[PDB]
Design a protein around this ligand. Structure first.
Ligand SMILES: O=c1ccn([C@@H]2O[C@H](COP(=O)(O)OP(=O)(O)O)[C@@H](O)[C@H]2O)c(=O)[nH]1
Ligand SMILES: [Mn+2]
Ligand code: NA
Ligand code: NA
Length: 276
């Protein structure tokens, strides 16, 4: 055994996944016939104003009854801002997006006027085809994102146990992603299965619990328990090197680095889940 070798494989682990740059697009969704709220207009203007280096868009859908009046209302409220409104059906890639099995279910869900539920599918499809940052219309921009880059090209906020929930879930807003990101693709694959199975449980469709399952499948160490087992494997390697044998704070920080970095949207957006 060699402590020189050990220090080197700890250094290697820290740097295993180079940070991948995120496209400077902020995607938000306001689909359906309802007038966007005064609060969500203010939060949207604030999102765009804090991010002058980003193109901020609100996506609507001309395939939904009553879309025109809702689109017109938004056009008037955002006329002074750099926010642009875009029809999902106008996207250059819509011909391919329309053929996605998940888009079949998006169409079924918007027909039943479940727009929040439909947004869980649509946010993933937009990230798949464009990359950038998806944010809920009702999420608070704390400060500008600036130039972001994430290990495995995926950025999320910290997990927590949601209201009346059992297990910790990563929120599915905001999400930063490289185009065609494996985590986004896995979430869509799990969602298509849940919908094909005729799932009625709203926690088992395309929401935070499904996003969390996708993140754990693609990046196992995102689970605090699995990272624990990885740290224990390095502790064993340190014992082998020295055969004082416990991992230092610095060693644990190095081994955990990319998993902490993936939670890097935590400081930029507040979803109000932590409000009194
Ligand atoms: O009529 C509606 C209702 C919701 N949404 C979108 O769906 C997102 C998710 O819904 P919501 O924020 O209500 O979900 P939660 O914050 O409870 O997860 C919203 O932020 C909007 O971006 C929409 O486009 N039209
Ligand atoms: Mn929300
Ligand atoms: Na499932
Ligand atoms: Na190891």
């Amino acid at each position: 055994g060699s402590m020189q070798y050990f220090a080197q494989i700890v250094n290697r682990e820290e740097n295993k996944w180079p940070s991948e740059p995120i496209n400077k697009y902020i995607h938000m969704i306001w689909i359906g016939p309802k007038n966007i709220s005064d609060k969500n207009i203010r939060l949207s203007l604030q999102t765009a104003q804090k991010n002058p280096d980003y193109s901020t868009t609100i996506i609507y859908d001309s395939g939904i009854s009553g879309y025109e009046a809702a689109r017109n209302f938004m056009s008037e409220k955002f006329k002074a801002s750099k926010i642009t409104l875009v029809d999902i059906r106008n996207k250059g890639y819509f011909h391919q997006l329309q053929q996605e099995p998940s888009f079949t279910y998006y169409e079924e869900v918007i027909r039943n006027k479940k727009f929040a539920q439909a947004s869980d599918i649509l946010r993933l499809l937009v990230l798949k085809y464009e990359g950038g940052i998806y944010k809920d219309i009702d999420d608070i921009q704390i400060k500008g994102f600036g130039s972001l880059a994430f290990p495995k090209g995926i950025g999320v906020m910290r997990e927590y146990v949601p209201e009346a929930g059992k297990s910790a879930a990563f929120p599915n807003s905001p999400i930063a992603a490289t185009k065609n990101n494996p985590v986004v693709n896995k979430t869509l694959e799990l969602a298509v299965e849940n919908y094909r199975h005729g799932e009625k449980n709203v926690l088992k469709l395309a929401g935070p619990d499904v996003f969390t399952k996708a993140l754990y499948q693609e990046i196992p160490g995102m689970c605090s328990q699995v990272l624990g087992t990885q740290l224990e494997q390095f502790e064993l390697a340190k014992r082998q090197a020295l055969k004082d044998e416990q991992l230092t704070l610095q060693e644990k920080a190095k081994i955990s680095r990319p998993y902490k970095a993936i939670r890097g949207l935590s400081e930029y957006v507040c979803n109000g889940a932590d409000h009194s």
